[PDB]
């Protein structure tokens, strides 16, 4: 119909290609860093308690 969907500016594709090449050149250390953050997430998991009472999940008015 008109001139509506057109690409303006080229700055995200270049940056994501940059981080992709960063992954490709060093796949060893990036994997161990990412899995290190993963373990930091996982060690909190086995200590986990639920609450079945919804009285403490509502306001008091």
């Amino acid at each position: 119909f008109g001139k509506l969907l057109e690409p303006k500016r080229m700055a995200r594709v270049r940056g994501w290609r940059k981080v992709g090449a960063a992954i490709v050149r060093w796949p060893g250390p990036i994997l161990v860093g990412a899995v290190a953050l993963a373990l930091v997430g996982l060690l909190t998991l086995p200590g986990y308690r639920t609450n079945y009472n919804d009285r403490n999940y509502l306001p008091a008015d």
Binding site: R17, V19, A21
Partner: protein, 78 residues
């Protein structure tokens, strides 16, 4: 000549990577001062060269080369 064909292949790579026209990509100017290149874009150039035009440029040697003439000389000396 081998030099001009290697410069043409590299210029095709730099055209695909950082959007710089092959006409003024010449071996008489540097990368980071004139083309405004990054350190990770050198990694892009290296990886694309490895897959497309098979020749090995290792790590810690991208920083050794600064001009396009240096890179084409590095390719032709192998």
């Amino acid at each position: 000549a081998t030099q001009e064909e290697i410069i043409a292949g590299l210029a095709e790579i730099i055209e695909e990577v950082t959007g710089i026209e092959p006409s003024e990509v010449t071996p008489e100017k540097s990368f980071v001062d004139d083309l405004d290149i990054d350190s990770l874009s050198m990694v892009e150039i290296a990886v694309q060269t490895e897959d497309k035009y098979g020749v090995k440029i290792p790590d810690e040697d991208l920083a050794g080369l600064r001009t396009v003439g240096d890179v084409v000389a590095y390719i032709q000396k192998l």
